[PDB]
Amino acid sequence: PHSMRYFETAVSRPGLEEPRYISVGYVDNKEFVRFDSDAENPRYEPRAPWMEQEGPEYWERETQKAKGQEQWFRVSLRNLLGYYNQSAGGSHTLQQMSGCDLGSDWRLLRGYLQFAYEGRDYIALNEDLKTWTAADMAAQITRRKWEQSGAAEHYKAYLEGECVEWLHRYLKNGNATLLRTDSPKAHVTHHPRSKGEVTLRCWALGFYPADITLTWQLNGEELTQDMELVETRPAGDGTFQKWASVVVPLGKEQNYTCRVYHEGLPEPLTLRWEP
């Protein structure tokens, strides 16, 4: 499967007219472009080596679109303030996520268009790309207004055409990078926990992509409950880290095994505590 998403944020600043606007583009969950109005010279910038292939025309067009989005978000932020009867001053946020998912057949599988106000669902385009889903009363106002304008058709055309077109291009351009894997480097640590009990922590480091599965087994059985799994976190160099631990009776560490599953592993790893 594959995907492309553009995550945009506009933040109202007390004592300022233009909001802070930030847009980040992703291909298969990897950041590849970015725009920030707070920069000295607001411009879309490459964030993946394979984007240096795009000519000056590409950046020019993208940067213009951003300038447009800034104004759209600015006017919209103003409107919502009235819809919710919020006092002037204060800071508010408007976000948007748009994009498309391709299936195994590399053909369109689904388009997305969602807006959030104050970090909460506002209005979203349904999978049919024709109808809107409003999360609350204020959003119903926007929905009713957009049903009249055929706003959905506009977005539908981008999600089935342009989105699809560029995702294929980026996939073709950044292929050697996007499709690569860095299989995990794993090991098991041993730590004191309490009276007659110790912790075994199974680490998985420097892997890519982020998706991964770690499990613990006692006597051939899975330890879903009793297993503490941290949230996957970035190493900061493009790769990820994760660990899973279990508390065990001191003197039985050897009865436990950790398994690591990852796309870069044709066969899962099997680790044990090693004194």
């Binding site: 553009y6 945009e8 847009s23 583009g25 993208e62 679109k65 951003a66 447009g68 989005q69 759209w72 006017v75 919209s76 409107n79 919502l80 408007l94 948007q96 748009s98 268009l113 807006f115 106000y117 506002y122 209005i123 926007t142 957009w146 304008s149 706003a151 506009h154 977005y155 981008y158 999600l159 342009e162 989105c163 077109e165 560029w166």
Partner: peptide, 11 residues
Amino acid sequence: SGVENPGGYCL
């Protein structure tokens, strides 16, 4: 390539 929200279609 990002989407462009219709100019006359704000929230």
